Design a protein around this ligand. Structure first.
Ligand SMILES: *[C@@H]1O[C@H](CO)[C@@H](O[C@@H]2O[C@H](CO)[C@@H](O[C@@H]3O[C@H](CO[C@H]4O[C@H](CO)[C@@H](O)[C@H](O)[C@@H]4O)[C@@H](O)[C@H](O[C@H]4O[C@H](CO)[C@@H](O)[C@H](O)[C@@H]4O[C@H]4O[C@H](CO)[C@@H](O)[C@H](O)[C@@H]4O)[C@@H]3O)[C@H](O)[C@H]2NC(C)=O)[C@H](O)[C@H]1NC(C)=O
Ligand SMILES: *[C@@H]1O[C@H](CO)[C@@H](O[C@@H]2O[C@H](CO)[C@@H](O)[C@H](O)[C@H]2NC(C)=O)[C@H](O)[C@H]1NC(C)=O
Ligand code: GYG
Ligand code: NAG
Ligand code: CA
Length: 387
């Protein structure tokens, strides 16, 4: 009954279209939640889309100023994948930062809300509150914004507390049926870790995260579920996956250290190893959240000098807005597959035609077959939306 993910990673040639919800286009002629920080996680049968609501629908006086990151009204929404966040969506917990996963038996939700300097993380398993932890550094306790990972009934999640522009306090929690059974401190050479996109890599858990301090290469966190040990580093690939970052011709990376290239700030992203190669996504703009592309970097997981990409796919064309992206893993008959979602942000502050800030999603899954080309942006006409 417990998921173990003890199958090899599927062969991957690229990614094929899987889901899109068109939520902003629908918002103009229907009651749809205002959201951000979406993600996808699946129970053994089917996938669900999650996001952080703003306690309001879009066509609604309360959508004004929803660019704001943390309010007492934000809640974690959960629908089957492809059901847009309509008024019958379940708010599974109070949260302005979250992570959820299914351990094969039940859902775990990790939900952070409350004051910036004294936030509370609730742990809800199988529909009931089982544990909670207070902010340890009094400076915006925050977590993955994408699925956690469970092996043999032990779920792990990565959480950070402290500065967004300097050394912070990152901890990796081990949760069994909703109870925190152990807490490990981040260790290794990752110098700043946020918004980890984690996946099963039996017998352990591997994460590619966001360095908001000095790195435009992405940190890696490796989690041993048995002995609770932690190691960390950076995605070697000379083509780096954060935003902002330097242009392709002049960017560099490092397997152990942040590259000190437009390292400040960032955006939630993902990557995963395939042998010594690395599959990764990133925005097409090096400076802002415009466009989205995927490709494989040959020797990109082990060689910081490789900028040799192949199998590029445009997910969102450079002229349209993207945003966060994260990984989720889906068990197939013979192998574990890798999928990702792209948050498609519309509104303030970058688009001033409206007062609100929300997103739609588009989702793609690894394939061993073939695929072609396209572009699947949000598609709403911001000039014709309710203000
Ligand atoms: C982050 O979040 C945590 C958790 O919420 C929070 O900790 C909590 O703080 C509150 C507020 O201080 C604590 O509740 C208080 O408990 C004291 C008693 O505890 C103190 O004293 C005992 C020994 O006496 C010590 O063992 C203990 O360590 C503490 O030092 C109560 O006295 C408090 O009640 C009074 O204050 C309230 C407002 O705070 C009033 O509304 C209330 O009516 C009481 O006042 C009345 O009685 C007073 C005399 O007792 C008198 O002076 C007044 O004028 C009035 O007549 C309150 O219940 C709570 O226990 C903490 N929880 C934990 C788990 O530690 C952190 O503070 C927070 N941090 C930040 C930075 O936000
Ligand atoms: C949306 O919210 C903003 C507040 O963030 C409102 O704009 C401010 O409103 C007050 C009161 O009129 C003024 O003092 C400010 O000058 C306004 N502009 C700012 C802060 O830039 C705005 O009224 C709200 N809009 C709607 C339609 O409710
Ligand atoms: C807990 C929290 O507020 N996280 C915010 C992060 C954070 O400020 C940076 O990671 C620096 O720590 O910033 C992003 S962002 O799109 O503005 O990049 C938005 C996030 N908003 C929410 N998750 N509700
Ligand atoms: C990329 O960055 C470097 C350094 O700013 C600059 O010399 C170069 O012209 C930029 N643009 C390219 C290579 O298209
Ligand atoms: Ca960065």
């Amino acid at each position: 009954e417990y998921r173990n993910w003890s199958k090899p990673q599927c062969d991957i040639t690229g990614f094929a279209p899987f889901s899109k919800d068109n939520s902003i286009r629908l918002s103009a002629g229907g009651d749809i939640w205002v959201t951000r920080e979406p993600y996808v996680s699946c129970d053994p049968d089917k996938c669900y889309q999650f996001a952080l609501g703003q306690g309001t629908t879009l066509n609604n006086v309360h959508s004004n100023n929803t660019v704001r990151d943390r309010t007492p009204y934000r809640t974690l929404l959960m629908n089957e994948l492809g059901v847009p966040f309509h008024l019958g969506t379940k708010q599974v917990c109070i949260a302005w930062s979250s992570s959820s996963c299914h351990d094969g038996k039940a859902w775990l939700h990790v939900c952070i809300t409350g004051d910036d300097k004294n936030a509370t993380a609730s742990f809800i398993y199988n529909g009931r509150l089982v544990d909670s932890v207070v902010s340890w550094s009094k400076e915006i306790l925050r977590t993955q914004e994408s699925e956690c990972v469970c092996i043999n009934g032990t779920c792990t999640v990565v959480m950070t507390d402290g500065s967004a522009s300097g050394k912070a306090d990152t901890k990796i929690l081990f949760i069994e049926e909703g109870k925190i059974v152990h807490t490990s401190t981040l260790s290794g050479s990752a110098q700043h870790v946020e918004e980890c996109s984690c996946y099963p890599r039996y017998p352990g858990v591997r994460c590619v995260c966001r360095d908001n301090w000095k790195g435009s290469n992405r940190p890696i966190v490796d989690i041993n579920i048995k002995d609770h040990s932690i190691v960390s580093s950076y995605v070697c690939s000379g083509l780096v996956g954060d935003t902002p970052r330097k242009n392709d011709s002049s960017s560099s990376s490092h397997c152990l250290d942040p590259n000190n290239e437009e390292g400040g700030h960032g955006v939630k992203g993902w990557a995963f190893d395939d042998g010594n190669d690395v599959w990764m996504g990133r925005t097409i703009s090096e400076k802002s959240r415009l466009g989205y592309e995927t490709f494989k970097v040959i020797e990109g997981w082990s060689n910081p000098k490789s900028k040799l990409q192949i199998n590029r796919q445009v997910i969102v064309d450079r002229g349209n807005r993207s945003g966060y992206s994260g990984i989720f893993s889906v068990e197939g008959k013979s192998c574990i597959n890798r999928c990702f979602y792209v948050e498609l942000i519309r509104g303030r502050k970058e688009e001033t035609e409206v007062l609100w800030t929300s997103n739609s999603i588009v989702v793609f899954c690894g394939t061993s077959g073939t695929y072609g080309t396209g572009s699947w942006p949000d598609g709403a006409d911001i000039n014709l939306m309710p203000i």
